[PDB]
Write a protein that binds this ligand. Structure first.
Ligand SMILES: NC(=O)c1ccc[n+]([C@@H]2O[C@H](COP(=O)([O-])OP(=O)(O)OC[C@H]3O[C@@H](n4cnc5c(N)ncnc54)[C@H](OP(=O)(O)O)[C@@H]3O)[C@@H](O)[C@H]2O)c1
Ligand SMILES: NC(=O)c1ccc[n+]([C@@H]2O[C@H](COP(=O)([O-])OP(=O)(O)OC[C@H]3O[C@@H](n4cnc5c(N)ncnc54)[C@H](OP(=O)(O)O)[C@@H]3O)[C@@H](O)[C@H]2O)c1
Lengths: 223, 225
């Protein structure tokens, strides 16, 4: 079955730029599911403090981005677009041989809402893949609502996480990881060359949120 | 206060489908005509459009014309030609479409041994090209994600699909949302301004990739709305 997934328990997860909403939201849910999580930050002090407020008795701690990248079995990139290239260029060697999950949305915002920025490489995920030929780059978690992830009263989210990439085993691991967030199914969304439109659909989700006063997600039907 | 889900009454409206003799055009036509709308199929040949119309038309208000006459006949006009013919068709009909709601469902897609991918478009997207060719029309992007074979299938009572409807004109988008809802199962969901149409068009390459992996006719639903 294409729905079959590997057992990913005992994988540790680093989250780079883990000190904001997206990173804290993912870290919180993975730690609640039992994974050791390592938050990364440009300042290790700031990461350890955020880790300490994240939830009592959760297996989470903080380091600088390089330590986090070195510590984690799987590494999630959750920095803003503006620091994406420079971060990954600096951690090329630390990330060699690892699954690296890019959730970065290159978006702009003006008085009419959100829009998608152009990217030389095709997409944030394709940029990552071009910088890190020795990593298995996977694109995932662009559509999560970090506020729902962080909220203690949210038990489940109504979301299929699209997981893109060129290596089957890597995309499978990240689909299994996605499913540790209650309500989520990890759904194979294509090869990395079709990540642009996934990142950019976040601008449409922002538009939808505004129109409908919602924290919208997506489900794929018929699968 | 009005719900964003509320729909205008479109029960008057005739629909023209340009390039309406293919699977997409026939499937839309079938469903719209089953819901009571007059549908005019367009073709490069009036006789071919008439023939396809006769095939679809048992018990249904479907007729055929050349593209120019369908475009003139339709209250709302759907563009269902391949990406290769899109520019040339629309330049030719510029005056005939002035002042009309024009719906672009065209997906600029490439295919190779690794599956589907999305083509670059100078204007941003097929819909934004349409809007640049047709400044006097009200261009709406919709219907990119429909599975035409499901629309044609007498065994399929309803489709598990939100149709994303994009555009810069609120009334035009609302009309098109209401048209989309004439397909059983479907909600017409506002998906943003026309500048965010590229990603919608291109996401059809992701659906294709899903269909090939899971062996499926995948759709999408927007949740929490
Ligand atoms: N928020 C959501 O709902 C959501 C959902 C899906 C995806 N995303 C994506 O996740 C990423 C982060 O979102 P966010 O809401 O958490 O944003 P954020 O708070 O602006 O950024 C996350 C963290 O990145 C670090 N950082 C900032 N600038 C940096 C730079 N130039 N170089 C290296 N690190 C830097 C900061 O940590 P330190 O100061 O501790 O280094 C900051 O706390 C974005 O790319 C976004 O598109 C967000
Ligand atoms: N099939 C689907 O499930 C689906 C779903 C969503 C969107 N779409 C999109 O809908 C459009 C139509 O798809 P389809 O499957 O119906 O394709 P199609 O059968 O390849 O094309 C539809 C019709 O377009 C006309 N045509 C072809 N080339 C033309 C040109 N250069 N100039 C003017 N007319 C031309 C032909 O009609 P005449 O020969 O009678 O003029 C043909 O029957 C495409 O842009 C596709 O991306 C398809």
């Amino acid at each position: 079955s294409p729905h079959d997934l590997p057992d990913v328990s005992g994988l540790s997860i680093a989250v780079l730029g883990g000190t904001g909403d997206q990173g804290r939201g993912l870290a919180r849910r993975f730690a609640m599911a039992g994974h050791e999580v390592i938050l990364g930050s440009r300042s290790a002090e700031r990461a350890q403090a955020v880790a300490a407020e994240l939830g009592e008795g959760l297996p989470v701690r903080g380091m600088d981005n390089a330590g986090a990248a070195e510590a984690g079995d799987v590494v999630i990139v959750a920095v803003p677009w503006d620091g994406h290239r420079a971060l990954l260029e600096s951690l090329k060697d630390v990330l060699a041989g690892k699954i690296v999950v890019d959730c970065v949305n290159p978006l702009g915002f003006d008085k009419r809402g959100a829009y998608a920025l152009p990217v030389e490489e095709g997409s944030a995920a394709e940029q990552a893949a071009a910088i890190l030929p020795d990593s298995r780059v996977v694109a995932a978690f662009h559509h999560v609502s970090a506020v729902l992830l962080l909220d203690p009263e949210v038990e489940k989210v109504d979301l299929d996480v699209l997981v893109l990439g060129d290596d089957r085993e890597a995309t499978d691991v990240v689909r299994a990881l996605a499913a540790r967030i209650p309500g989520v199914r990890g759904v194979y969304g294509g090869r990395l060359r079709n990540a642009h439109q996934v990142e950019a659909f976040t601008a449409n989700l922002i538009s939808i949120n505004r129109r409908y006063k919602a924290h919208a997600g997506i489900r794929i039907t018929d699968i």
